[model samples]
Target: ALMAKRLVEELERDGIVKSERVKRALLTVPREEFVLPEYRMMAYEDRPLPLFAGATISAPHMVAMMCELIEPRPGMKILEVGTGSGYHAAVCAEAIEKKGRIYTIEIVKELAVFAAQNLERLGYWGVVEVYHGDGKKGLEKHAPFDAIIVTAAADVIPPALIRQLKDGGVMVIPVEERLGQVLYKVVKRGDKIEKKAITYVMFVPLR
Candidate 1:
């Protein structure tokens, strides 16, 4: 746990993790469990790790930042577009507590299985579900989530995702443009959609 503490402390020092609630939840999850055995030792390094099928687990600080951006709360329904190693999903699950739920989608079938196994092994099964499919479409059956987070970068925000968000809901995603990948925070208010660019970031292109 000391290793995780150092990483968490780093996040705090960098001001990525602002809230105590999010900090505690970030501390509770063991990142090593969500990474491959080869890179388990690097889990606390505060960088992304390559997973199977060319996928990568999001960086620790990015995960914390996104958690803070979404303002996760108990009982909120969240949707995650990338489940690379399920690390981010677990963090979101911890922040939301057992009452909330997250449906994470992974285009790679093998990564989906690996993510599900990791979530189940860590007792996050009840709060997180791994779906094997294209995240671009979003999940219409469970439409209208309180928040939606896309881990991968897309050329443009998928229209379906915007439609799936309930009124007053929010979404955090990475968009790739000529300048580079930029993280965007979008809020839905009835017929109004507010979009704000949060930061310049680097991420693999969304499938």
Candidate 2:
């Protein structure tokens, strides 16, 4: 109980959770359930926890920041790369609700299965779809997403990702360029794409 409250307080303090609905959803979802048993105790900590398949859940602050920047809403469609522990995806699912859809892909099969099971337990069974594949390819079958959130760092925004973005939609990605690791908000306005650095973050290198 204390930990959950702390998590909410910390996230709120950082201005990650804006809407009352988002705050309520984050409070209700059990982040510990998505983490491995050994890491459950630290589930509410403000840091990323390692999961199987060389992936880690981004820190709480990072998650909050990402969600805030993306500004997901009910009935919006979203694509998530690097499902990881599925914690971030779950939070997104909870906030977006049933009217919205979340199509997430993870490169590692085991992690994908784990994420699927966990999401099912959270009752995100119908709203969030989990796929096992190379996320760099993007989910072409479901192109023109309302928003695309990539959890892993990429050398550059994959062309497949750019193709998937619907006009007026946004793609939030972490790019590891010669400059360094930075979280970028890529906004697509018709044929033109604009990139702006949102934050400095270190993430597991792209595969």
Candidate 3:
């Protein structure tokens, strides 16, 4: 818990995280419980750790920044792609209230199972639904999400994901281009999707 506190302090220093509610939610979710037993000891460190399969639980800073960019809120239904370690889904579940739900998908079956188990053990199983499938589709069966967060870097944003966002909804994703990385914050207004590039980051390429 001590190290996680320091991590939140560093995130606040970045100026990207300004809301106190956001900080409290990020801090309340125990990141250590999300990782494998061996790497749990260093869970608070600002670096990615490999989970089962090829997926990774992003660093605390990365997760915090992404969550802040997406700007989750009370009663917001969130859809998360790349549910590695279940950390991202768990964290968002902690923030949203009023019986808000988090629907997440993992490409790897084993990782999806692990994510469900970890979330259930933390007593967060009530509000989260885990699926094993391609994240490119963005959980269309449960479309019109309030917010969608795609953790892996994609060469191009998935069209299905953009279509999944509800009106006035926001979707945060990493867009890979020839020049470098661009963090795309997309918002749906009426039938149009307006995108703004927020920051530059390097992440494992989206499959």
Model 2, span 1-207: residue lDDT tens: 788877888778777776666776677778898988899888888788888778887887777667777776888788989987777788788778668888999999998999999999878887889999988998999888988989999988899998899998888899997667899998888999999897788888777
Alpha carbon lDDT at 35, candidate 3 = 87
Question: Which residue ranges in model 1 land beyond 4 Å of their true spot?
Answer: none
lDDT of 1 by residue, 1-207 (tens): 998788888889889999877888889998889888989888889888887787888888888878888987899899999888988898888898868798999998889999999999989997898899998998888889999999999898999999999998889999998789988999998999999888898888898
Task: Output the worst ten-in-a-row residue range by lDDT, candidate 3.
Answer: 90-99
Query: lDDT score of model 3?
Result: 0.84
Q: How many angstroms is residue 148 displaced in model 3 relative to the true structure, after the best TM-score fit? A: 0.4
TM-score of 3: 0.95
Off by over 4 Å in 2: 19-21
lDDT of 2 at 52: 74
Top-down TM-score ranking: 1, 3, 2
What are the models' TM-scores?
Answer: 0.97, 0.94, 0.95
Cα RMSD to the true fold for all candidates: 0.9, 1.5, 1.3
**Candidate 3 segments exceeding 4 Å error:** none
| Cα lDDT, model 2, residue 195 | 91
